[PDB]
Amino acid sequence: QESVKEFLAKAKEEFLKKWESPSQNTAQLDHFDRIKTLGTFGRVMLVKHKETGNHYAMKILDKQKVVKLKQIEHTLNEKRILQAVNFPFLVKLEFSFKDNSNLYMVMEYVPGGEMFSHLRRIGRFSEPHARFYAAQIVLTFEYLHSLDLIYRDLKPENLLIDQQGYIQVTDFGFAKRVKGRTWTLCGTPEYLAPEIILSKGYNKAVDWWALGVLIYEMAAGYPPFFADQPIQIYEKIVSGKVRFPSHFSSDLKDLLRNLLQVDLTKRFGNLKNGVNDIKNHKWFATTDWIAIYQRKVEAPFIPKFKGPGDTSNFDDYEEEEIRVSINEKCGKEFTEF
Numbered sequence: 001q002e003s004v005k006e007f008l009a010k011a012k013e014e015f016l017k018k019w020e021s022p023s024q025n026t027a028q029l030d031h032f033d034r035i036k037t038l039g040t041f042g043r044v045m046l047v048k049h050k051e052t053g054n055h056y057a058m059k060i061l062d063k064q065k066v067v068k069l070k071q072i073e074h075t076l077n078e079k080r081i082l083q084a085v086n087f088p089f090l091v092k093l094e095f096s097f098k099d100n101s102n103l104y105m106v107m108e109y110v111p112g113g114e115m116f117s118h119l120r121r122i123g124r125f126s127e128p129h130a131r132f133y134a135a136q137i138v139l140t141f142e143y144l145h146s147l148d149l150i151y152r153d154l155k156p157e158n159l160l161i162d163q164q165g166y167i168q169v170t171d172f173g174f175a176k177r178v179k180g181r182t183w184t185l186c187g188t189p190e191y192l193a194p195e196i197i198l199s200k201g202y203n204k205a206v207d208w209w210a211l212g213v214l215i216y217e218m219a220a221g222y223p224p225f226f227a228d229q230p231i232q233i234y235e236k237i238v239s240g241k242v243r244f245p246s247h248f249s250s251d252l253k254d255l256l257r258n259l260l261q262v263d264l265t266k267r268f269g270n271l272k273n274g275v276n277d278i279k280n281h282k283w284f285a286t287t288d289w290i291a292i293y294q295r296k297v298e299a300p301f302i303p304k305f306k307g308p309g310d311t312s313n314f315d316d317y318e319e320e321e322i323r324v325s326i327n328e329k330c331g332k333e334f335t336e337f
C-alpha cells in the first residue's frame with residue numbers, strides 16, 4: 001500500500017540526514033550519578049542525570065579493549081546507527097560522548113528487563129504472546145532493512161520490555177549499513193544463519209533466519225539448535241534438521257520451516273514479496289500490523305517494577321570503577337565517535 005511505501009521513504013530520508021551528519025559529544029560523565037551495573041569490552045550502567053533527574057542506561061566501552069578485540073568499526077557502526085534511527089521498538093540514544101579512556105552511549109532506560117528473564121521465569125510464551133513480540137520484530141526489521149541496515153544480533157537478551165509491555169531492541173554492536181553482501185563472522189552461535197557459519201557473503205536474510213530462531217525459542221522455551229560446543233551447534237544449524245514440540249500449531253511449524261530455511265534463496269523475507277510473505281502468513285492472521293505499530297494493542301504482559309529507577313528486573317554484578325586515564329588513549333582510532 002502507498003501509505004507503507006511513503007512511510008518507509010520518509011523513514012529513509014530522515015535516517016540519511018542524521019547518518020550523513022552524526023551528532024557527537026552531547027554530554028559528559030560528571031553530568032550523571034552512577035546507580036548500578038545492569039550488565040557486563042563493555043558494561044551497561046543505570047545512571048541519573050544530575051540536573052533533570054532522568055534515568056538512563058549508559059553503555060561504556062573501553063577504547064583499548066575495543067581495539068584489542070578488533071571491534072573499532074563495529075563500535076563506530078553502533079553509535080552512528082543509533083543516533084540516526086527512530087522507530088517505536090528501538091532504544092532511544094539521548095547522548096553520546098568519549099573521554100581519555102572510554103566511549104559512552106546514553107540511552108533512555110527501559111526498567112522492565114530483558115525478554116530473556118521473563119521467558120525463563122514463565123518457561124515459554126503462548127503463541128499469542130510470542131506472536132505479539134514477533135510482530136514488533138517483523139516491523140523493526142522491515143524498517144531497518146529499508147534503510148539498508150542489517151541487525152545481526154537478535155536474541156531474547158537484546159529485547160527489553162518497556163512499561164507498556166512492548167519491545168525496545170538494544171545492542172547495535174553488530175549492526176551495519178550494507179548494500180549487497182557482507183562477510184564478518186559475528187553474532188551469537190545459536191542464532192547464526194548457515195551462510196554466516198560457512199563464511200559466505202551474506203545479506204539481510206540472516207536477520208530473518210534469526211527471527212525463526214527467536215520465535216522457536218519464545219514458543220518452546222529453548223532454541224532449536226543447541227549443544228555444549230559451538231562446533232556442534234554449527235553442525236546442527238547447517239543440517240537445519242529441526243524438531244518441533246508437539247504443542248506447536250501447524251501454522252507455527254509452517255512459518256518456522258520457511259524462516260529456518262537453510263537455502264537463503266528460498267527463505268521467507270528474502271523472496272520477491274520480501275517481508276509480506278511473513279506478514280501474510282497464516283500464523284500472523286490475527287495480527288493488526290497498524291495497531292501494533294501504533295502501540296494500541298494491549299500487551300500480554302506488563303513487567304512489575306516500582307518506578308523509572310527500579311532495577312529489580314535486572315540482576316547483580318560486581319560493581320567496578322569507571323576509570324578515566326589522565327592520558328588520552330586511542331584518540332585517532334575513535335576520532336569520528
Ligand SMILES: COC(=O)c1ccc2[nH]c([C@H]3CCNC3)nc2c1
Pocket residue numbers: 038039044057091092107108109110111114157158160170171314
Ligand atoms: C536502553 O537500554 C537499557 O535500558 C538497557 C538495560 C540493560 C541492558 N543490558 C544490556 C546488555 C545485556 C543484553 N545485551 C546488552 N543492554 C541493556 C540496555
